[PDB]
Amino acid sequence: IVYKSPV
Amino acid sequence: QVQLQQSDAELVKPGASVKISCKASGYTFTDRTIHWVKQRPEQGLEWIGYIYPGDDSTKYNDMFKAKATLTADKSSNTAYMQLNSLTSDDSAVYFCARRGTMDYWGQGTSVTVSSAKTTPPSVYPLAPGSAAQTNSMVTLGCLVKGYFPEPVTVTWNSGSLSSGVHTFPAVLQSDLYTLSSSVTVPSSTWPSETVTCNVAHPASSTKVDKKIVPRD
Amino acid sequence: DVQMIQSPSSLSASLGDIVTMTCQASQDTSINLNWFQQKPGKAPKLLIYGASNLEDGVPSRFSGSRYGTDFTLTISSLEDEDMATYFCLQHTYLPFTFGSGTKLEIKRADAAPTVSIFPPSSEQLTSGGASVVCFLNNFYPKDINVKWKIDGSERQNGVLNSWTDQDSKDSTYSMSSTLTLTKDEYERHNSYTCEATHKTSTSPIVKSFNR
Numbered sequence: 001i002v003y004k005s006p007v
Numbered sequence: 008q009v010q011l012q013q014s015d016a017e018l019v020k021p022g023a024s025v026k027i028s029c030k031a032s033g034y035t036f037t038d039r040t041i042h043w044v045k046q047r048p049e050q051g052l053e054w055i056g057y058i059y060p061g062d063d064s065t066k067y068n069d070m071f072k073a074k075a076t077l078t079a080d081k082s083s084n085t086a087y088m089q090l091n092s093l094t095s096d097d098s099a100v101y102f103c104a105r106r107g108t109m110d111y112w113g114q115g116t117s118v119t120v121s122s123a124k125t126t127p128p129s130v131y132p133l134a135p136g137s138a139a140q141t142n143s144m145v146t147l148g149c150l151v152k153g154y155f156p157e158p159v160t161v162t163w164n165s166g167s168l169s170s171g172v173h174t175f176p177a178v179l180q181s182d183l184y185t186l187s188s189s190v191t192v193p194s195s196t197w198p199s200e201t202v203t204c205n206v207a208h209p210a211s212s213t214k215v216d217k218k219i220v221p222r223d
Numbered sequence: 224d225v226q227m228i229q230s231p232s233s234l235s236a237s238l239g240d241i242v243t244m245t246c247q248a249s250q251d252t253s254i255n256l257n258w259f260q261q262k263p264g265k266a267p268k269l270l271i272y273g274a275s276n277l278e279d280g281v282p283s284r285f286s287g288s289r290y291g292t293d294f295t296l297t298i299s300s301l302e303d304e305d306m307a308t309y310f311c312l313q314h315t316y317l318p319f320t321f322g323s324g325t326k327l328e329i330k331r332a333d334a335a336p337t338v339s340i341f342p343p344s345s346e347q348l349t350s351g352g353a354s355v356v357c358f359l360n361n362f363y364p365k366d367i368n369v370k371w372k373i374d375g376s377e378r379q380n381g382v383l384n385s386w387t388d389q390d391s392k393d394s395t396y397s398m399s400s401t402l403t404l405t406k407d408e409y410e411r412h413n414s415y416t417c418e419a420t421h422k423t424s425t426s427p428i429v430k431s432f433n434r
Binding site: 068113 | 257267278310312314317320322323337340344346352354360386398399
Binding site for chain 3: 001003
């Protein structure tokens with residue numbers, strides 16, 4: 001559900 | 008310069024498949040996600056999904072999980088989108104974009120799903136009628152009729168005539184497109200300084216040049 | 224889905240004005256919201272990310288704010304180069320969603336079309352077709368009506384019209400109108416007339432020729 005830009 | 012360069016427009020038969028490319032440059036390909044987006048003229052953008060070339064993970068919008076396959080080739084720095092079982096609803100412009108924030112976009116790839124036959128254009132020159140009345144500007148034209156699919160690319164004097172041009176959007180009738188283009192030029196420079204319209208139709212591997220000459 | 228509801232769908236303003244548009248989230252959740260500018264046939268360009276942060280190289284004439292779940296894009300000192308469609312992007316929850324877009328038109332003074340009519344070309348006639356082409360160029364506002372007449376009688380069948388997008392230099396519009404006949408019918412008549420009029424006004428601009 002939540003997107004997070006890869007580190 | 009971060010750049011995303013997409014493959015050319017494609018004509019595909021209903022039921023067939025298409026594979027679209029997005030070549031990334033100017034950054035390390037395995038450090039950013041690539042997202043794909045569908046644009047139709049009356050629908051407004053829809054998000055398709057994304058791939059992270061780092062680990063080749065993917066996520067999809069449920070609307071597209073069955074139809075779209077996102078892949079990546081780190082050696083050529085290219086992302087791909089395969090679309091399957093195509094239907095007229097899939098006719099659209101498809102974009103790739105960098106990161107979830109989408110800070111750089113490719114130029115778009117126009118896909119036409121249709122069983123109609125590829126057909127090259129007839130190009131007709133438009134010069135003023137023999138009973139013309141003169142002033143300081145003349146308007147000339149090119150009529151481009153009976154071709155399929157889009158796009159057609161029209162220039163004047165191979166691109167060196169650019170000001171005063173109106174190239175109108177094509178209109179589709181009976182599975183063939185028609186468009187026209189006008190150029191307006193100082194009346195003392197025609198016909199002494201020639202004007203020629205150039206019409207390229209990559210789908211039929213055809214280009215036509217027509218010089219505009221005065222009517223007899 | 225966390226959808227973004229955008230309004231207005233279009234906007235008409237003068238040079239130098241301040242203009243706004245909004246996207247409202249469809250759920251009471253915190254989201255990261257971006258604004259984009261897209262010109263016809265071109266790729267979108269990022270203006271604002273995180274509701275209010277200005278993308279590098281974008282003029283500070285552009286700014287964004289958030290009030291609850293209402294997000295606002297503001298453009299000051301409107302310029303010709305700002306003519307475009309603007310849309311927002313919700314990029315927190317999958318699937319990402321976009322607002323349906325706001326099309327931004329620039330006002331200018333009214334202008335009558337420059338009208339030019341062209342008889343069929345000789346090459347077209349050899350194939351049995353006869354298209355009469357009428358250009359209505361550089362006019363304002365966009366609402367204009369074309370009327371065709373053959374030997375003084377109005378004709379509707381076989382007319383195709385096409386409009387350009389608003390011109391980014393002078394904010395005018397142009398249109399093309401094409402009456403397509405067979406050669407058989409074209410040779411049976413003599414006077415072909417293209418007439419440009421607008422709503423209410425009764426004084427048209429007329430171009431015609433005789434075969």
